[PDB]
């Protein structure tokens, strides 16, 4: 079987939530996740006298510091009969040999394993910061609930009383609503990412059109972070100070494709927020034997004999997508 | 007798269906097409505790998986009488040379042959995502039937009861009808490609021309399809969570021009829906000698003798356009 | 006499009816032009069994293929007594040399000469796409009629019914009228070339200026081919999906300048339309002696003896501006 | 132990006050900070004939001198239990090395320390420019007062009969009121930076948005100096000759965040105003031996033995932010 060196992917296509807020990652060397080891936030400086004295600063973890990671180990078979996809610049002549066919099917399995894991991680991040709460479910797995600690003031519901869909489309100005909803953000917002359906009603107002910018974007390197995600991510322009992004990602359930976000919703927040990317241990004999207990991903290839005399491929991981301060965003439930 | 390396075209101008739905291709190393050998889609990551053996993600195929490809091989004359278009100041001295003239005419003949094969692929694709059924028939070809698996709920006919035409053009709103039609789609819908006359009445609604956002800089990179296909595809604008595309493409029969789509239809579709581009084997005596049995296209230039003492150039293929999920679309038949 | 190879112009400034619709050129090797030799259309395909052989594919579609090229050979005399545009600080005393000045006047004569061919070619193009019928009639030239094949339904006049002049200039939307004239075009339209006096009334409608996205640098890339001929061509901008451009080129008669298009005229065409730039044969003994029977232009410098004792320079060309599909464009006579 | 030269930080994150008003710095070689030692201002010339010598010029600067700065000195331990951040594309082999892990911990502790000092260095600046009065407190410090020498008229709070909150929101123009506030500013006003809670009140006026040209690009230098703080500061636009900034940075208490400015307040000044950055002696036994008595910061690492047996890293400085003309800024307490 192919060794552990079969890890040649080096593709960074994290979709808009692991790249914009959850950039930093903290893999752990224990079964669970403890927030005590996390550096946390810096304190004040606390004026003291001259050399007379001096007191030591300890960065605590607060109240809750024990979470259970979402361990995952999806498996594929490497049956050497699947018809290989016609990737470009592929000569069938140096392809008929099994030594290359198997070597490429292994890489294909690695690619779609990594894609599934990363997409589940993004689903986890969206479930985390769309409402602040979160849960872990699954067949043959004990349910687990994770609570960030989102304040109730950051879950503004537009349906109650005053919506946006029942106002004049040529006289109503939605800037005041945006300011009133972003006032309680605990920090200046610059990202107001919408939904594909939710953006239509917002843009339908005429007052936004003239003020809205389309000048290619002049915010930051964010346009570079968007151009790679050309399919499900669109960058629109300037609201005057903040950037507008419409994101329409999809994920594949049992047989049906669904969006990450609830249909008519939007979020305000900051592009400089702190998003934890904690990971548990890869509870495998080989990983512990090779000192790779603290890692984000773990590929493995082997051949099982006797009853299932087949060769398999696994990518084990354990995400616990976490947010430092849940109250730095506002989740508007539009209607 | 030119060599077998005469396939230098590099013209990826597939017309709006081989590029939005059937982006994934699969050559086969066997005569028929065994759909069970397709790797298939990917489910999320379904969680398991790291003490129990994981479940193998296997490509569960359908009840029927043994299809027959539609072998197609057009051949052309290379008689050095056909006039040649003038490339910009391409040294007209060498034109009189027959050796260069035949080599030049081979290239144009190959472009014509390839264009003569692009259309059968989309004659298959239009039937596939318009009805879920397709018959391959022709002179000296035994009829073949392909049942994609489309159900009744994805073949709504507007004539069944209340129709759009027999309403009031200035007051009626079709958004509710569009939502009802998209309800039974088994997945997100964002593309509703129309007909050149199936759209002239939908726009006639007073509410539609107000709701439709015809502004440039629209949803996504889909406008690239407009730039590539400036001859048959237009992009009318936005409609909320769905774009408006008018496809007046035409295919030419023996002497006449005809439309791909019937006059009054629309397709509630997903731009991310996967479509198979499976191909059969090149069932040619020469092809097996060089190991080109599993390939998409196969050119061959040769010289016939005895009765038709001329020389021909032929291109063989076997397109079997397929969809993994036929129920991902809705074919509404307007009236 | 100067050598024939002294033909250095390479400054093609074709005015938007030879660079937008008539890109492809077909020089001929026969005194007349045989349209049947043009490639034209290619049939779709035939579903054939892999065993039996298919039928040969021919080049059909055209019936009448007889046309008379409009031979044009203007000449200039090259006496060295003219006044010349003094190059800024390049000719301190080189002008004193008669040979250098004569070579300069030869170059300038050719530069002025090519315009007398470009103007007639563009006039041919306007005659083609404004009515579909063209007449060749001049002194010492027999009158000949050429008909593109344009149907009568594409020469619709705004006078019939309610013209735009007798209409509201504040509330009415001409988009309905524009599209009502656009179905009978056989292909999506995106070019609406106007005449400034005809375009003046269309600009008046408030719905236009509300919809006329005059934002420069739009997704349309035609302006790249427009700014080169900025003398008489503007670029008004986008109109949703279609592109509005104003053309006011004026061709010089014997001493007077006349507009290419009548005042209240407008066209609907596609920027990727196929236009033929077929050329006849230069029926000159000198060209035939060097095998230049098939070419676009053929300069000739030669000195006369005895009665008109001077030196002359001819340029001979046989332009036969043709259209593949004459019904693709629609020419409306505004009112 | 880490060498004293291990001071590789090169991060400049001054929060909009040390980066715009308090540029120049004056570290001191004496324990207390004597104000009478600043360079000061200069007389004009004192005209003198060129036969007689002129009096030598002497500039002193200020009278009240014997101030006393705070002597903040935060510490940190290097307990090698912290879960180190997974730096992108770093190998796991190096993480096993204890020396590299210790160096990484020291480097992170340096960042945490330096982010703890700038908080006081900015709280002092905010307190100085709101009232010109600022007291230093803290356990075991004997609170020390700082009277900048403000006038009384430069504290105009809107508390009369008419305030900005209880008047007309459509016809009132705040230009006159802003100019009346800026009249007693001892200079030309240039910055009207807001606290966002107080900003939202000003933003509601239509007379503001009818003239607030919030075009992207502040002045070509301000937005260059403020993009680094994408988390705390934001730029609104230009109000004519002046710009508007919204500062929302928060200073953290022992466990809780607090705002630098009172919510409904604004302050007016200039970007060219001079602000002193006087420091004091770094009263350290080793710093005296290394000839660094007068400096801005002083890192130190040591290993304690026996009772608090650990290894400590400490940063110590002495900030005594000052101004030359404290009465040039006007702090309006809105209502």
UniProtKB/Swiss-Prot annotation, chains A, B, C, D:
Please give the superkingdom of this protein's source. Viruses
A Pfam family found in this protein is Phage_cap_E
Q: Name one GO cellular component term.
A: host cell cytoplasm
Per the UniProt entry, the disulfide pairs are none
Family label: Belongs to the lambda phage major capsid protein family.
- Keyword DNA damage, does the record have it? no
Q: Does the keyword DNA-binding apply?
A: no
- What keywords would UniProt list here? Capsid protein, Host cytoplasm, Late protein, T=7 icosahedral capsid protein, Virion
What the protein does comes down to: Assembles to form an icosahedral capsid with a T=7 symmetry. The icosahedral capsid is about 60 nm in diameter and composed of 415 major capsid proteins. The assembly is primed by the interaction between capsid assembly protease and portal dodecamer, and major capsid proteins assemble cooperatively to form the procapsid with the help of capsid scaffolding protein. Major capsid protein forms hexons and pentons of the icosahedron. Viral genomic DNA is packaged into the procapsid through the portal vertex.
Question: What is the protein's species of origin?
Answer: Escherichia phage lambda (Bacteriophage lambda)
- Report the gene name: E
Report what the protein is called: Major capsid protein
Where is the protein situated, by its record's location annotation? Virion; Host cytoplasm
Q: How does it assemble?
A: Homomultimer. Interacts with FI protein.
